[PDB]
């Protein structure tokens, strides 16, 4: 039995920690909602 609990407001934070790269990938999406890489 699943239940929900509030965790916060949805707002942009000024000076939030900035990380992650920006990869450009060829992908395929199947009927089950699974993404896979195309090579």
């Amino acid at each position: 039995d699943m239940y929900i609990e509030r965790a916060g407001d949805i707002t942009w934070e000024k000076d939030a920690e900035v990380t992650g790269n920006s990869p450009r990938l060829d992908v395929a999406l199947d009927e089950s909602g699974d993404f896979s890489l195309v090579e």
Partner: protein, 156 residues
């Protein structure tokens, strides 16, 4: 139950203790999460019940109490923020420049941030605080790192 707009954890007591299986967004009286988090099951909010209203396994999305309300889109140029809600940890904003998933049916933004599976459904926001999609459906690239699509639904 609590209907205030914002980000919420999705929990279960079926397994050991109380386990966080995902996250979602309450907006305009509708609860939005990824299909793989709830598998389309009903949810409890205090003493109240939230019933599924729309869902799609291929999009990996589901809405409760009403139709999908989120319609903002990534502009293709600007940094965005993942409002990550990890299991047992406080909500935290992480800013990043999305990459792209190129598909036969068009391009989708993607965020290269790696969080526990229980963080699925956390919202990705633009600079106006609008939800441009949900985090948690993606791919594992060569180096073993995770890249999530920015998954957004259609507002009918």
């Amino acid at each position: 139950g609590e209907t205030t707009d914002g980000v919420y954890r999705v929990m279960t007591r079926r397994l050991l203790g109380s386990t966080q299986v995902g996250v979602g967004v309450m907006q305009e009286g509708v609860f939005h999460t990824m299909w793989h988090v709830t598998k389309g099951a009903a949810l409890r909010s205090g003493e109240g019940r939230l019933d599924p209203y729309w869902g799609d396994v291929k999009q990996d999305l589901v809405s409760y109490c009403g139709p999908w309300k989120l319609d903002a889109a990534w502009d293709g140029l600007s940094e965005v923020q993942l409002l990550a809600v990890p299991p047992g940890e406080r909500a935290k904003n992480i800013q990043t420049l999305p990459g792209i998933f190129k598909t036969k049916d068009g391009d989708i933004g993607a965020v290269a941030l790696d969080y526990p599976a229980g963080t699925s459904g956390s919202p990705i926001l633009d600079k106006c605080g609008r939800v441009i999609g949900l985090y948690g459906n993606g791919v594992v690239i060569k180096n073993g790192s995770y890249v999530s699509a920015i998954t957004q639904g259609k507002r009918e």
